[PDB]
Amino acid sequence: HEKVTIAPLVLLSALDHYERTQTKENKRCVGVILGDANSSTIRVTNSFALPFEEDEKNSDVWFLDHNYIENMNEMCKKINAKEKLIGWYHSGPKLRASDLKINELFKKYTQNNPLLLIVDVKQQGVGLPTDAYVAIEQEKTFLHLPCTIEAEEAEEIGVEHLLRIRLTNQLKSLKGLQSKLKDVVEYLDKVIHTILGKLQDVFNLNNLQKALTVKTNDELMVIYISNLVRSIIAFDDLIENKIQNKKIQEQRVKD
Amino acid sequence: ILDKIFYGVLDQGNGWLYVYETPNQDATYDSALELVGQLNKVVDQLFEKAS
Amino acid sequence: TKETVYISSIALLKMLKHGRAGVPMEVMGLMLGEFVDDYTVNVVDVFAMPQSGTGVSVEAVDDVFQAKMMDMLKQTGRDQMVVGWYHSHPGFGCWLSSVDVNTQKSFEQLNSRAVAVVVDPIQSVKGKVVIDAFRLIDTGALINNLEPRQTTSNTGLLNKANIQALIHGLNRHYYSLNIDYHKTAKETKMLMNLHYEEKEESNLAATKSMVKIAEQYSKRIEEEKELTEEELKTRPKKHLSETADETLENNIVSVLTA
Amino acid sequence: NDKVRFIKDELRLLQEPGSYVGEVIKIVSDKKVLVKVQPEGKYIVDVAKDI
Amino acid sequence: YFKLKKLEKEYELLTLQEDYIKDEQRHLKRELKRAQEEV
Amino acid sequence: SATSGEAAALGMGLCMLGTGKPEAIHDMFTYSQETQHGNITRGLAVGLALINYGRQELADDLITKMLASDESLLRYGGAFTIALAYAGTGNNSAVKRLLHVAVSDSNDDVRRAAVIALGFVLLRDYTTVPRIVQLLSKSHNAHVRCGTAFALGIACA
């Protein structure tokens, strides 16, 4: 599959618009992304904002500015001519049912499949909660793609200036287990379709991990053997330094 | 069999042939044994000039 | 004298990206924010001006394109007027040219509080951005001779040559300043997203090394044997310690897969 | 701690113009040595105060 | 009695200097990353 | 107003010296985070230290709340609270708090306020003052070395 990369310039741009647009009472701020989707790795080097207002009790009322789309063409094209509109982004933690109708408005300006980017403004997740989706023909479905961080001279300089293993993964595995656990509890309470089909894929593919235990410990002892021959070398860098430090002490006594 | 052209084993009691040939594994014995012989000569030069 | 100039975290990332247009081609763009008396310059948002073949001159500024964009920024939540503009001088130090003096003087009648910022993205690759600002004089704290810009501290003049020779003698179009950044609690975790999405990549690298576990340790043991003979024939330890460090990272992490 | 002060103070050493390369030809009673630079010509400079 | 309690306060002064160096040695490695990489 | 608000913050702190009113501790701490001015927020943080004078361990309620905030101005005045409350007779627990702030916060001014506060807790005995200062004289962060000079200008002066 393809890849999606979001620069920290786009990250901080979407996260700052929360307090800039006075977004509260669980609302969203619809932006726009600028990148090159022609390659296999989608990289967004520019982003902007758009005014968005939606009623809480009415999902059929939403405001969008299509005039600002033509305003960035008179600006960005005079600086970077390789910037095009590959889609938009949202500041909400989870998508709603209105995103299906938003794709009809941007399909004329975008020259390719629009990209759906979701950025969590609450920062309540672990790692990179920012996710991306690609709308294709199912009627329509959203194909998720992994999100990475852009590494370039135009970003890491500003990141290092403002700012300056398994234990982290343990908290990440709990998020995947509790997500499926709470989904079953909410399902049984509201009743007594794609999740039920893919749910048993994990159960039939951790009692099954105990059959290879005989072959698992075969390569585990090699790790300790590699550490045993390395442990002897560890003393070679120590005792040798003790001999050198002893010769330094003999010169300090004569002083 | 002894010429190591094809590794195998016979059975002269019942007149049969069993399985013999098996591959090796590196970074375990041959690689570690050659390191023990080298480290043994290096440590001999440590305490020699240390006293 | 010195003062404190606050710059938002979002403004620094945009100025470094704008300066990437080209090294020989100088870039210029506007800024937004507020002020506290004469001793505080608040930089909140920045604007990207179009390129011009005149090399950032007084005639390279288009007020028609400026008025159209600033009116559209009001719908995006920007209530702040223009606090100045930044001009990149890559490859050199922090100094003002003869063109920047005539260009900044033309904006004195428009906004007397405008600030001309000199950013150097070439020398900023060391992890700390080298940047300097220059502000016009709206007076009101000065008139003939007074002492504005409270809280003189931190670094000295530095810069390069021309604007360092005269500080209190001619304060009009140039004088030294300092750079400060103010971040909130929510802006701290914004840059913390670099490090279960990344958990899959941890086990993904272990999958390739699972079949290569015999080939990886084969090159490490044979390398330690060659480095041992070099230490014995010396009668070194630097090259030997570097190999043991890579072996330690390939062992404990490989145990974490179980 | 010393490595922190040695690296931060290296900026003054890196920005230093450095030194030329020459050879000694003859000396005088004025404590001035004749230094012959290989690409350039000969120059008469003052000897160091340590030697 | 007066000189006996003076030795008890000297043990705390040695602890203040001991606990700070143990914390400083770990923070010096962070300054080395900001040093060799920047210069 | 940052011009008239800076001097207005220090005027209330001078009347709170010694015992003072404990109600002003939570008031000056709450209004400090709600103010967007730098001089006003800094004046309220410095004034919190002048409220508790000679309280020793009784000021730990204000010390924890000031060090828990991420504001560089609130964390800067936290070292002055330990200096004034523990002034004269000190405690082993108060010095450990000043040493942890200098190695944690990256602000060169906050790190400098930690070594200056070490002189007021050592006022009981002037003999052991240079033993602590001599370790911080050769360290890095020249901004911190500037504060270690006054460490001998407070106690042993």
Side-chain angles (χ1 to χ4, degrees), chain D residues 23-40:
Chain D
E23 294 178 351
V24 175
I25 302 301
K26 63 182 178 181
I27 60 172
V28 296
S29 64
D30 290 344
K31 294 177 179 177
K32 294 184 175 74
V33 63
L34 176 61
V35 175
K36 182 179 179 180
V37 178
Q38 185 64 59
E40 293 178 350

Side-chain angles (χ1 to χ4, degrees), chain A residues 169-227:
Chain A
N169 291 337
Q170 293 300 321
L171 296 175
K172 294 177 179 177
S173 63
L174 296 175
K175 183 178 179 180
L177 296 175
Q178 293 177 336
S179 296
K180 294 177 179 178
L181 177 62
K182 294 176 179 177
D183 181 67
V184 176
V185 176
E186 294 177 350
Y187 176 78
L188 296 175
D189 291 344
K190 294 177 179 177
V191 175
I192 61 172
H193 300 291
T194 59
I195 294 172
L196 296 175
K198 302 299 183 181
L199 178 62
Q200 294 179 337
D201 291 344
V202 177
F203 297 96
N204 290 283
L205 295 175
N206 290 336
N207 290 336
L208 296 175
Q209 295 178 336
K210 294 177 179 177
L212 295 175
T213 300
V214 176
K215 302 299 183 181
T216 299
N217 291 283
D218 291 344
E219 296 301 321
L220 295 175
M221 294 182 287
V222 177
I223 296 169
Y224 295 93
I225 294 170
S226 178
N227 290 283

Side-chain angles (χ1 to χ4, degrees), chain D residues 1-2 4-5 8, chain F residues 138-141 145:
Chain D
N1 190 30
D2 290 344
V4 176
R5 296 176 63 185
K8 292 177 179 177
Chain F
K138 294 176 179 177
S139 64
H140 60 285
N141 290 336
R145 292 196 297 272

Side-chain angles (χ1 to χ4, degrees), chain A residues 141-158:
Chain A
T141 187
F142 296 97
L143 178 63
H144 186 278
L145 295 175
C147 296
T148 59
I149 303 301
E150 182 67 14
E152 63 184 343
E153 69 282 3
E155 297 303 321
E156 293 178 350
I157 291 173

